[PDB]
Amino acid sequence: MRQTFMANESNIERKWYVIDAEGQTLGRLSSEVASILRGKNKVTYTPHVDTGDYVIVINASKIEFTGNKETDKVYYRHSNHPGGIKSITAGELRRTNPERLIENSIKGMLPSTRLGEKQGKKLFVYGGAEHPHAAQQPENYELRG
Amino acid sequence: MEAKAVARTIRIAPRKVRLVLDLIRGKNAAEAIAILKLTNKASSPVIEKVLMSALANAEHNYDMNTDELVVKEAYANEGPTLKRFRPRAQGRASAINKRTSHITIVVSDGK
């Protein structure tokens, strides 16, 4: 227990990033954003505290699929009532609620713990080009790819 | 600055007694007396006698003014249990516990 640094709330500095989903692939963008949200890009990464940064995604409606995912990829949910299975295609979900599509992709890439839930709450997704968080002064972030 | 009274081996169950003691704990003496007088429970007259005995001890043994006293402590401990039986059907006998309480009241002037 010699010398390993540990981040805590006193020394954690969380930045605000903005990422454009225009012409990006859903899964690849999502994995990169999940890394940023969890703080894996920080030298001070500490697993039991949230060292990540806030991420805004600003062109969710122009996110892109490959292959035939628009009609063939199906999102299923169950209401916990008998026969209460419902489904919607990825294309229909992009047409109706693209913010939900991107948000659910990223949160499915995040861990399912209390910390993971809070880190996922750090994500703000908007279908169109504008976002309401000018007061946080977000900085443009380019996807590494 | 404190006076105590204890009624030991009262033939009432401690759970039942604690129901009323919880009403009176921490209150001023007159308020506790009124609560006990108007509380419709079996334990209330017994607790009232304990509280009156404590206030009398405060006045007579420690030169305390009875109008400035608070029920600092009020509790019921378990006493010895009377073991009894009730005949049930098919010749069996089922246990009956007639429990008892040690009721303690401590009044204080706050000094």
Binding site: - | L19, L23, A34, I35, K37, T39
Partner: protein
């Protein structure tokens, strides 16, 4: 019909959270300087 497991002290006390009585509704009587139940006569 019968308990499958014994009830822990924690569970029993959690259940007893609401098992309590209330101080009765009482008001002061003017002449005698005592207390009585509201809407009752001495």
């Amino acid at each position: 019909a019968v308990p499958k497991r014994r009830t822990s002290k924690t569970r029993k006390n959690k259940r007893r959270t609401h098992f309590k009585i209330s101080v009765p509704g009482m008001t002061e009587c003017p002449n005698c300087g005592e207390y009585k139940l509201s809407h009752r006569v001495c």
